[model samples]
Target: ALSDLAFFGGPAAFDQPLLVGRPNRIDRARLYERLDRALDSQWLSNGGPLVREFEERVAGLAGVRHAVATCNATAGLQLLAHAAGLTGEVIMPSMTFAATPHALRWIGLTPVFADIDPDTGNLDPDQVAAAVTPRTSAVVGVHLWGRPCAADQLRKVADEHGLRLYFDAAHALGCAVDGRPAGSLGDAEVFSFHATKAVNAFEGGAVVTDDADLAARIRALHNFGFDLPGGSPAGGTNAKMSEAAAAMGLTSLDAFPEVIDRNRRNHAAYREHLADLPGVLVADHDRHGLNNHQYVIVEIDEATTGIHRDLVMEVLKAEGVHTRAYFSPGCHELEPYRGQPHAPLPHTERLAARVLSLPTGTAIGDDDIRRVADLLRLCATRGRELTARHRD
Candidate 1:
């Protein structure tokens, strides 16, 4: 039996469970208003009016030449990969969601896992350089945790190697680097509108690109390869976003500004509360116009705090402050990519073990953040005592 594990069996702070990530409820009246249009037209799918409108709006927002909506971000990534003709091994970071690597596999491309930066958790270009080989056809980078990667550096490497560049902007909808939006940085970028993302459509995704031809190809691929009305030349699948999802996306747009503000507030609160806590480091970025406050990740240095990351999580859970270890195992450690040849991922491995993503958005409040901080301090103190006892 476990010995309480330094506050793991502490009394619960709240009866209600606080989720790690959840869709922010939109204005029902506004959602209903948009849905009325879908109902009135009786067009539920197949690139209907709502889908077109959402695509156009997203294209403008992302500052891209075109944006094509798909059933989900994974499909969007697959479409982009197909459009770019990504074959051979594509280099990417192992510190991302499974979708990033899965997308490469779907396109018959081998994903060569690379290491990430110690600070931002984004792919380290130096490691990328070390991982490249003759069979490398492209480079896939992610805006991990909604923070933009070093776009110029990655693009330089891609250009130098004559490799196509793509980005998995699943966590970076409103994120921008040096005033350029996330989608505009690479050859093509994919954004997710899953229920948990800041800009949700219940379930949808979009691929954005400056190249008109590439966008056209992705559009065609998502629509069963029918570039023309009657001819099916490309091997496309049915990955079109339904009118219903578009309707929700359209409504969600109306709430985006408030959502951003709320998330920023939550992020600030977490930073403020955890500022003085030793061994606690909040993840942050320096993007010019970044609003990817979709997550508030904290790193717990066990040697400094004398507490393990998982132990903190267990204590937080017992305190009714639910948290998640986003990308905990690292993509390379997963079964699909296990035993795969790759460069060293020292930072990726260490960060994966120490990172914890706290709850964000409007559902939580300042009081809740203070409570989480208090519990963390309590656990840290107890952890030090336990450590001293063990040493003695």
Candidate 2:
């Protein structure tokens, strides 16, 4: 009933705010032990035992020859670009976090925006190729929402153009492309261990690569350009991950399997609950490998729903079901890049207009997801009438 909605004076759908990207539950026992080890050694940051162990474990899981930990993914990316000897422009998808381009622009590498594949929400290989120019030095592909990109196709394009290929795998830690994992896809891939990511280190990241030379360069860049113990480094800053962060990372890794199982079940609950909704499309995880199922994004057709995306978001928020419109404005439309010359981005614009990233994670449970769907259904059933009420 219209009266059943909180907007219409009924009780709110959820007792508390059901927000997205809550940090993964940590393992305190393991964390304390790791922290104690670090404290005992009195080596907290550079090449600490904890950091080394975390790097090895991450490398093993990602199927890479090396993993260099950073304070965060943004720093990891900046280091990767510098280490890879990239100069001038880089082509990347605009439908990604601002950090994707910001990291490049911070280091004088112009980010040439490319439209995304509407199906995958990733940089289309053809668009990436088309976006390349004389100044383009590299191609940085993002694995959006833990879904893999066309790594091989992108590699082929990069190889054809003699451009370096890398990945901003902020959203794709346990994800893979083709029959392979993301870390082994491009020349290098940077993973974010942001609290909101699939696997978090409180705040940390890593650059994974099969190229020992590139790894050496990144390690140097991450530290003070000193690959060895004692020497005058060329140039570098403190982008190294702390022992505390690495300790958290290892703890998170230990519980990763259990967390992943929970994520899959939570994702499934959302799918089953929202399956019958008109004009609502839940994103699929039928891609090649195990998706982290981090974000439960869905596209709502405004015309069919009789309400715009903003209004739907507004309705959800009023009901205490907090949601996010992921990567809207397409990075190209955002400041600094808005004035920069770029090609038409029809698909990116369409996705920006419609997609909504709903709440999921270790925080919310099956009942929460189901109730959120019920709220959506109630909103849809009362769409036009509710729309008119807003006007009043």
Candidate 3:
């Protein structure tokens, strides 16, 4: 069935094996340029000048009043959970990366797994509404795979229930919905700058918010709760970003647009090549200002293709085409979360089995994309023939 999709573009070739994702190529001169500044200042970490500059630049980019840099997004989430005064249960989607729910556990908050949208793989607001209870104190929605969740509906639910609304915007650094940027969507948003993310600082994260008080609290928490006026006496740990990381962040920012554009182009190529496949469908890029094309997800229907999603991946691997089944087991189904109570996660369960995240980055090009699509076409055709033979 998938063989019917028209293949366009130039010759297909796989020079090397492709990974699902990769970091932006570091601009060595620019990186060393900033690092040199850090060395001259002799301030390695703890809210140094470089760190402050990076924070301000990121804050401006995110359209937030303040941003506090942290060692990682999980630490930022822990701070957000504590500073928001969250207690009891926090509802989140089970279809996201483990970090989203793991942050809840770090702060002694119970994580209530919820279902997600079948198409977008993001938290479904209706399901979120059904998951709430008197014990639910907050809702943390993730911008899964750079696609924003139903922010308007989520905010409405939060207001209706008197609950704090936060966002795990780790995958949505450059993304925006209807002109509103990702980091500005909720009460506060936490972003990751890990190597694989849109904006990488090797290993760093930030909390962006318009609330000055909340920003102050996050910063103090990041710095061992040290401040002149007052700080968390017993509720702080070291999570501050080092000056070196900040310097790298600054350099990465300048090179980010090039990387983002390349990713978008590569994603477009994948969607185009697989446009008419019956058993495979590329995800929609319908949002405005969709920043990084961090993932190019395709939903494979075994009923139509006659091959399991895992089977397709295994076949592709031999062809030197790498793919990732992101959140394959779903966070709720993981060993740590086994036996946990959850509302009907039909969409989440279904997507976990079918979804595949293909390689996307500047390193990949049209040839690489065509190479991947060609293998997929071959797999689908073979699978269809096998199914017909079995039926006969």
Candidate 4:
């Protein structure tokens, strides 16, 4: 009944709101113990022991030759752009966090927005090729929802054009495609460890690459363009990860497998519970790749479901089930890039409207996912009734 639904000012379904992207907490004892070792050594920052270990461990996990740890993913991205010698326009999808374009902008490079492949929700190779210009310097791909983008096809496009390639892999830390890990793709890939991620350093990120020379350049540029040891500060603002953050990262990595298991379980529960609901589809991982299953994405088709995506969001929020309309307005439609020169984004615009992310992680339990699914089912069964009420 519409009156039974929470949006009618009824009681919230959950006692406490279930938030999207909430941090999967690590054992505090382990974190504190690691921090103690760093404190005892009195090496707090500027490439401390813990930071090195974190970098090495992450590099190994990603199957990459090098991993340069940074204060945040945005900084890691900016560092990579500088190190790669990108000076002109860079092609990327607008269906991403603002940080993606901002990283290029900080270094005076142009961001040329391009259309995406609707099926994969990634930069279409054909569209990427069409967007190429004389001034185009690189092709940047983002692994949206931990699904590795078309790395092989994108690589072909870049090679043919003699352009560099990279990725904004913030959402794909533990993901792989065609048996290759996310961080091992292209010239380099940046991963964010923001608290919201399944495996996080509280607030950290890394730029991983398989190219040794490029990695060397990144290391040099990371430390203010001082390609020499004990050299003077050239042009680098400090983006180094602190010892404390490294401790957090190390602790998080130790518990990485357990967190992925929980996310996988939650995602499966959503699929089973929402299977019969019409017009609501849960995005799946590519069969050829290894996925962390971090994000539980649901795409709503109003024509069939009889309820708008925004209405679904509102009703869910009222029921204490917080959701995220990620990339809702699309990057090109946003403030800074509003009037920027770019191609049309048909697929980006489409997904931006239809996509919604549900809450799932270690913090959320099996029961929580079951309850969320039931609420979604409720919305589906009484869809037209709620829509009609809203219209009145």
Cα deviation of 166 in candidate 4 (Å)?
0.5
* lDDT tens readout by residue for model 2, 1-392: 66666776778766788877778778788889999989998998988888999999999878897999999999999898877778888999999989999988887788898888888888999898788789889999988888888888999999999999898888777777555776788889999999887788989999999899878888876778875444323366679999999999999999887887788888888899997788787888646466878888888787777777788888888789888888786999887898878988999999989888888878878888888888777666667887778777
lDDT of 1 by residue, 131-237 (tens): 88999989989888878888889989888998888889898888887788888888888999998888889899999888998888788778778863443333778
Clashing pairs in 2: none
Q: Which candidate is the best by lDDT?
A: 4
Regions of model 4 farther than 4 Å from truth? 228-234
TM-score for candidate 4, residues paired by index: 0.96
TM-score winner: 4
Worst 10 residues of 2 by lDDT: 227-236
Clashing pairs in 1: none
Off by over 4 Å in 1: 1-10, 228-234, 286-289, 386-392
Ranking by lDDT: 4, 2, 1, 3
lDDT over C-alpha atoms for residue 223 of model 1: 79
Per-model TM values vs. the true structure: 0.93, 0.95, 0.92, 0.96
By descending TM-score, how would the candidates be arranged? 4, 2, 1, 3
- Which ten residues in a row are the worst by lDDT in model 1? 1-10
Cα RMSD of predicted structure 1:
2.9
